[PDB]
Write a protein that binds this ligand. Structure first.
Ligand SMILES: [Ca+2]
Ligand SMILES: [Ca+2]
Ligand SMILES: [Ca+2]
Ligand SMILES: [Ca+2]
Ligand SMILES: [Ca+2]
Ligand SMILES: [Ca+2]
Ligand SMILES: [Ca+2]
Ligand SMILES: [Ca+2]
Ligand SMILES: [Ca+2]
Ligand SMILES: [Ca+2]
Ligand SMILES: [Ca+2]
Ligand SMILES: [Ca+2]
Ligand SMILES: [Ca+2]
Ligand SMILES: [K+]
Ligand SMILES: [K+]
Lengths: 206, 238
């Protein structure tokens, strides 16, 4: 009798699972050859691995029990087993959790309020919003815009810095309620959030 | 809006956001890890640097967009004591037109080589067995557990097959004893013992690892000294 050998590619590299894979899905199917032709018994090994993965003994079908979150963990060293009548063979798989864009930008330091004189010069910086996003690359790069846009104030797309555009007038408008949108730059499925910005103006005697 | 400039710093490849690559452990200094990062732009429409690069394992060439292994001084060891299973760095892309910053994770998955042999935890092994021991008895289990051979590699490269080899200084050792299962290392008695004929055997025991390619498998050997103890019975046998 000669022992069984695993055949799948990912003992040789890694296995990519996207974090959005739903509970009960088939990840993959373990395959093994035995020179003796005898039937084999597949399983998983390890306290951590067994909580996330179940293995059907005869098929070697691996399925997901608990959900994956790239934001908690992005790598797992998992051990699989395959057994004939003479004993157990074990090999480790490096599992990589692929990121999806499943978080939207979070605004910090809210709420946002501003109090400036009506005679504030054009060009003047008057606030800076900030947001973060835990997703990877484009999914976690944030752009800021006003929605709707304002003829009187503008916001730098990358830095979130707010400046005066046109001369202000308390006698006409003493206060502005603006909405800042924060969007990630995910190509396929982009996500966004809104923050209020309150600009009250104080009167000069002009 | 000319969008030709928001799209700098994004990736012109597809697949996952992280850029994952496998390489062999103990790779030589200068090994290409990532050929081309495939970031839109020109490090001048952008600029690139490394964050989270502990032990400076990665060198960057910005113009090419190419990561190299920085290794002079030391070896990239996956096995104990080092336990370097993977290296993660961030390639930071500062977009020089609009001001965005994007982080491109690079995960290097370090592959195990069969670069370590099995090593017996004892210089030699020993058991004393009364001659009245029944045939078929498992007379030694000490190569199971963690006190037999140990191999610090991963999976098959670190898994042990035990066999009894022919001893020319003791030809009957391997006919009186057997390891029926190479992965356990349990030694079984095949033949009735006889204190008054042979009191000692030197059983040569080999451990090989199970690297897929047989030319790359490694070996250790030890001696199991079996002393036979004199047996007496109330009945008519001894
Ligand atoms: Ca077999
Ligand atoms: Ca998630
Ligand atoms: Ca995510
Ligand atoms: Ca996001
Ligand atoms: Ca006025
Ligand atoms: Ca006034
Ligand atoms: Ca090594
Ligand atoms: Ca190794
Ligand atoms: Ca080895
Ligand atoms: Ca006798
Ligand atoms: Ca006797
Ligand atoms: Ca007697
Ligand atoms: Ca007697
Ligand atoms: K492996
Ligand atoms: K069969």
């Amino acid at each position: 009798n000669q022992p069984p050998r695993f055949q799948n590619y990912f003992f040789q590299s890694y296995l990519l699972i996207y974090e959005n894979t739903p509970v009960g899905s088939s990840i993959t199917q373990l395959t093994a050859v035995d020179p003796d032709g005898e039937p084999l018994i597949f399983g998983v090994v390890g306290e951590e691995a067994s909580r996330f993965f179940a293995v059907q003994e005869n098929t070697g079908v691996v399925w997901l029990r608990q959900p994956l979150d790239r934001e908690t963990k992005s790598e797992m060293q998992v051990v699989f087993s395959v057994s004939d009548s003479q004993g157990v063979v074990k090999d480790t798989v490096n599992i990589q959790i692929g990121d999806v864009n499943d978080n939207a930008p979070t605004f910090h330091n809210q709420p946002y309020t501003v109090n400036i004189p009506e005679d504030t010069s054009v060009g003047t910086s008057i606030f800076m919003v900030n947001a973060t996003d835990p997703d990877q690359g484009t999914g976690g790069s944030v752009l800021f815009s006003f929605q709707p846009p304002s003829p009187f104030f503008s916001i730098d797309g990358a830095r979130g810095i707010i400046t005066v555009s046109r001369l202000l007038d308390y006698e006409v408008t003493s206060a502005y309620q603006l909405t800042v949108n924060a969007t990630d730059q995910d190509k396929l499925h982009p996500l966004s959030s809104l923050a209020n910005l309150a600009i009250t103006l104080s009167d000069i005697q002009d | 809006s000319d969008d030709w400039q928001y799209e700098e710093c994004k990736l012109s490849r597809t697949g996952p956001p992280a850029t994952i690559v496998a390489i062999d452990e103990e790779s030589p200094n200068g090994t290409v890890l990532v050929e081309n990062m495939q970031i839109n732009g020109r490090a001048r429409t952008i600029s690139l640097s490394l964050r989270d690069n502990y032990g400076h394992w990665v060198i960057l060439d910005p113009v090419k967009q190419r990561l190299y292994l920085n290794s002079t001084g030391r070896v990239l060891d996956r096995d104990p004591p080092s336990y370097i299973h993977s290296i993660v760095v961030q390639v930071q892309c500062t977009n020089e037109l609009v001001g965005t910053v994007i982080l491109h994770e690079v995960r290097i998955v370090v592959r195990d080589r069969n670069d370590n042999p099995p090593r017996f935890q004892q210089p030699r092994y020993y058991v004393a067995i009364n001659e009245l021991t029944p045939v078929g008895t498992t007379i030694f289990s000490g190569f199971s557990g963690n006190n037999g051979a140990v191999d610090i590699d991963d999976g098959p490269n670190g898994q042990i097959e035990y066999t009894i080899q022919y001893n020319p200084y003791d030809p009957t050792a391997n006919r009186t004893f057997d390891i029926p299962l190479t992965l356990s290392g349990s030694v079984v008695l095949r033949e009735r013992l006889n204190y008054e004929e042979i009191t000692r055997y030197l059983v040569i025991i080999q451990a090989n690892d199970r690297a897929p390619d047989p030319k790359e498998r490694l070996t250790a050997t030890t001696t199991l000294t079996v002393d036979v103890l004199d047996g007496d019975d109330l009945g008519p046998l001894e």
